[PDB]
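Work package 3, deliverable 3.1, input record:
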Amino acid sequence: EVQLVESGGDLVKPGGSLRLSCAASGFTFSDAWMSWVRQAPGKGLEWVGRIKSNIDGGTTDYVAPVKGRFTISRDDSKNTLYLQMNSLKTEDTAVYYCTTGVETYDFWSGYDDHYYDYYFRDVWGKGTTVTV
Amino acid sequence: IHLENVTEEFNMWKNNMVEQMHEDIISLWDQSLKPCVKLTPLCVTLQCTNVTN
Ligand SMILES: *[C@@H]1O[C@H](CO)[C@@H](O[C@@H]2O[C@H](CO)[C@@H](O)[C@H](O)[C@H]2NC(C)=O)[C@H](O)[C@H]1NC(C)=O
């Protein structure tokens, strides 16, 4: 079983800062690409940004309307993902979620990568908030 | 053939016969496994629970 254990939600104003985070359970982050998405009440899903595994460079990608004030980093010890937000807008009220794709390839043999069992799990945190 | 009036300085903890036998036995043991199945296809994740007894 794979879980993103999300925490750090709090009551904040735009004139402040907030760090939200997710600790993995079962799944580790040494090969985990991770992304934050937010949903304002009454709205659809807006991508915030993505961080690649540190083994692949640690490169990040951010969505223009949230760029700079919302950034993403990784712990690499206790499997924790962080979203650090500073100097926010009144438009940033939303439920934020952390998400990742879990790819499992269980091979039938150690001599050929032809026959195997491929399992794909979309794992989400519970949802935490940024308030105004 | 009892040697009668001979007195010889015996020593274990130097006797090389100990070493020869050690080599021999280890070697004979390894040879017996040469034609046997290698259990390498079985080095996989084994999901485990307690015995129902
Ligand atoms: C080990 O687990 C297996 C299941 O993975 C048990 O086997 C089943 O036992 C039930 C009850 O008798 C049968 O109806 C099933 O048909 C059995 N399945 C298979 C594949 O044989 C097994 O009894 C367990 N053994 C111990 C010692 O706990």
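Chain B touches chain A through three residues (CB under 8 Å).
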